Structure formats: structure tokens, C-alpha cells
Amino acid sequence: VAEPFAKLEQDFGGSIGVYAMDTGSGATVSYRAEERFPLCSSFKGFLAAAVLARSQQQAGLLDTPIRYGKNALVPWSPISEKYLTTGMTVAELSAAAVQYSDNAAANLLLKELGGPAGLTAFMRSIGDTTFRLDRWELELNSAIPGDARDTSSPRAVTESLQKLTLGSALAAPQRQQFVDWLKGNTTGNHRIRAAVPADWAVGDKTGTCGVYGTANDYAVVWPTGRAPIVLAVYTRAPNKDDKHEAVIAAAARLALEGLGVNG
Ligand SMILES: O=C(Nc1nnn[nH]1)[C@H](Nc1ccccc1)c1ccccc1
Ligand SMILES: O=C(Nc1nnn[nH]1)[C@H](Nc1ccccc1)c1ccccc1
Ligand SMILES: O=C(Nc1nnn[nH]1)[C@H](Nc1ccccc1)c1ccccc1
Q1: Which of the listed residues 66, 85, 86, 89 should we mutate to test ligand 2's pocket, taking the one with most ligand atoms within 8 A of CB?
Q2: CATH of the domain at 26
Q3: What are the catalytic residues?
Q4: Which of 52, 81, 123, 159 could covalently link to 131 via disulfide, CB atoms 3.0 to 4.6 Å apart?
């Protein structure tokens, strides 16, 4: 049903993209689900999944320490700036990237994977032909209208998230670690999580470009007594000065309602 989403995005003053999947029944909710939206920091969830995939062929990868200096620091590195010189393990960097959106951590891990093209290669390997990362933090946040760099679609985000958290794309230990990192995210309390009852489990990764009304969140949600739901909510707006969380929460509420999920 497009009517409620159309009213929401008109009130917002931009475009809202939603794809939600009930993994039990297969029912879906789609609104602008195949349009490209900027990933912004939301790429960092898939980055951590790619690191975990690498751990399936490199023993002890997650506990390997990476040393870095002031030169590795990027604005908004709230974890990595505290562990300078002495460095952090690959697992610590991955958790910081997912749960605090740490920019230096993300760029360090990106470097280990061969840059944006290496993360894109990992997404291709799990069957995602839509995702593309082209740049690093912070340039990937430009969110220019019509620019395909550093974008995906809500549908492709949800499908890949499902494969990685609930399907067979990662081995079982790596899958659970990915879920656990998403569950511990600290940046999403006002987005999808605000639409989810307190007694349901949720893991998410947010993104905020800071321009063009562009922000997003994707999540796996475990209601009690039924199969998990996977969903993605992305926004953008036509003007650079347009502001982007309540709209994301409202869109998530509508998506769950459209799936018949009482919550
Ligand atoms: O967990 C692994 N592998 C696996 N488990 N399930 N599927 N692959 C091992 N990696 C790993 C990564 C970080 C920390 C500890 C272990 C591993 C990789 C390669 C050879 C042998 C072991
Ligand atoms: O540098 C290190 N440890 C150290 N520095 N000063 N005192 N201990 C390295 N371990 C490490 C472990 C976790 C986080 C950061 C660094 C290391 C130890 C041994 C061989 C190679 C690397
Ligand atoms: O919001 C951010 N990161 C993030 N949000 N969700 N996940 N990560 C960062 N600050 C921010 C806060 C409010 C509005 C705009 C930006 C940030 C994003 C992009 C460039 C520079 C800084």
C-alpha cells in the first residue's frame, strides 16, 4: 500500500525508500524499493560482514592487531581516537565501525579489503548486483542527486542483510558475530528501533549523509513467536540544505504494519 508512504514522504519533503521482508511467509512491503539511495555510513555493516567472510579463510584474523597513528584519524572516530599508537584488533575496529559508526575504523578495514572496490567485490560474491561503494569516509557522504556512487537500493540492502544474518552467506560462527555486532549498535535508538517493541530483539546499522535530507537505517528484527523481519529504510531530498529520524521511525512502523506484524 503506497498511500501512507506517499503522505509520509510528502510531509518529509523528499523520497522514502522501504523494503521489508517477513522471512516466515515471504510477504513483502515495497515503496521506491528499487531506487538508488546513498549508503552514507550504512556501508559499515556490510564492511564488517566482508571482514567476517575474510575470517573464514584467514585464521586468527579477528584478533590480529592493527596499529595506527593520528594520520589514520578521520572526523568522528569516537572509539579509535582513544586507542592510538597501541591500536585495535580487527574485531574491535569492526565493532567500532558498526556500533559507533567510527570513521577511522571503517577506513582502516576498507584498506585491508582493497578499498571500496574490494567491498563491492564481496557484495557481488553474495549475489548483490546493486550495491556499490566508490569512495572512503568522509567523501562518500556527498549524496548528490542522481549520483550512483556509494549507493544501493532498499531491496538490495534487505536481501543482502537477510543472506548475511539469516541465510548461508556467512558460516555459522561469523553469522552470529555479525548479528551480535548489529544488536549492539548505539546509533539507532531513534530510527527503526523506535518502531520496535521493547521485548523484541533488533540489530541495525544507521547512515547519515548530512546533506540532501539523506539518512537511513536497516535492521533485522526478531518478534517473539514468529519469524524474523528484515527491512531497510532510506531517505533523500532534492535540496542540499534539506534536513534528514522520526520519518525513518514512522516508515518502519508502516512497513511492520503492512506486513501484518502487531507491535
Ligand atoms: O573461523 C575460522 N574458520 C571458519 N569457521 N567456519 N567457517 N570457517 C577461522 N578463522 C578465524 C578468524 C578470526 C579469529 C579466529 C579464527 C579459520 C580460518 C581459516 C582456517 C582455519 C580456521
Ligand atoms: O604491540 C602489541 N602489544 C604491545 N605493545 N606494547 N606492549 N604490548 C601487539 N599486540 C596488541 C594486542 C591487542 C591490541 C593491540 C596490540 C603485538 C604483540 C606482539 C607481537 C606483535 C604485536
Ligand atoms: O551522523 C553521522 N554518522 C552516522 N550516522 N549514522 N551512522 N553514522 C556523522 N555526524 C552527523 C550527525 C548529524 C547530522 C549529520 C552528520 C557524520 C555523517 C556524515 C559526515 C560527517 C559526519
Answers
A1: 86
A2: 3.40.710.10
A3: 41 (nucleophile), 139 (proton acceptor)
A4: 123
